[PDB]
Amino acid sequence: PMHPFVKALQEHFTAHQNPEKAEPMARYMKNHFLFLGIQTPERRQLLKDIIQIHTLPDQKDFQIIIRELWDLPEREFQAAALDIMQKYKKHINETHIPFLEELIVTKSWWDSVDSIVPTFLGDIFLKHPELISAYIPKWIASDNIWLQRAAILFQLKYKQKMDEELLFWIIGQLHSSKEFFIQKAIGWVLREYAKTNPDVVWEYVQNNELAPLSKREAIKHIKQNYGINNE
DNA sequence: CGGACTGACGGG
DNA sequence: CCCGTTAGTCCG
């Protein structure tokens, strides 16, 4: 924590650490991260305390503060970094895509990636759909499952603005993956989009290959709409 | 497989 | 209060 705002946050969080809670919290993330043991409601209040005392740093320091928090060992600091990014939301634009990519592929797990993709990247590609093809093909072709998950989930909240052809093309590229985080993301995005257009999702899952997990997750609700044919 | 439950977080 | 959801564990 070079930056004084980050140092203040580190000190304040550490003073309220809970080693008893940190153990199960770390186990929940498969022990990929150390935890201080601070859950979301308190963690947000502790951040708020520091903002009240120091004020939110000038936007010139935004990316710097995020990266410094990203570099700290305990997972709460990445969660706090994401809370802070939201506070700078109106300053984030298409020029930040590489910055967001780097966040996705460092300290990677489902918690951070899910908090970056459908919101920050989703909003950017909604305003600049013409940039999708500058990134999505690379993400799918990469060795990185989190970039692949990003390609699937960036349209999660699009509803009626969903690009169906694009969605199904992306899923087609990834449908053979044996990776849980890919199979489940496919299930999730289809389940969610089915809330907007159930007929299109139903037809897709009945007529295109998917991992068993992806298909069952996709239709967990809409199977009530159409029924389950006797085998 | 995949269903039932555990659970913290989001938000109607 | 309601119910949705990332995950997670447990079991036939």
Q: Which domains, ranges and CATH numbers included, belong to chain A?
A: 1-231 (1.25.10.90)
Spatial distance between the Cα atoms of A165 and A155, rounded to a whole number of angstroms: 12
Spatial distance between the Cα atoms of A160 and A111, rounded to a whole number of angstroms: 26
Residue whose CA lies closest to nucleotide B6 C1': A28
- The verdict on whether residue A143 carries a ligand-binding annotation is yes
Strand B contact with A86 (CB < 7 A) = no
Documented resolution in Å: 1.5
Distance A91 CA to B1 C1' (A): 47
Residue A78 contacts by C-beta under 8 Å, 6 or more apart in sequence? Answer: A69, A70, A72, A107, A112
Spatial distance between the Cα atoms of A146 and A16, rounded to a whole number of angstroms: 31
Strand C contact with A226 (CB < 7 A) = no
Strand B contact with A21 (CB < 7 A) = no
CA atoms within 13 A on the CB side of A218: 25
Strand C contact with A74 (CB < 7 A) = no
The sign one gets for the Cα dihedral A181, A119, A132, A75 is: negative
Spatial distance between the Cα atoms of A162 and A83, rounded to a whole number of angstroms: 26
Residue A72 contacts by C-beta under 8 Å, 6 or more apart in sequence? Answer: A1, A6, A10, A78
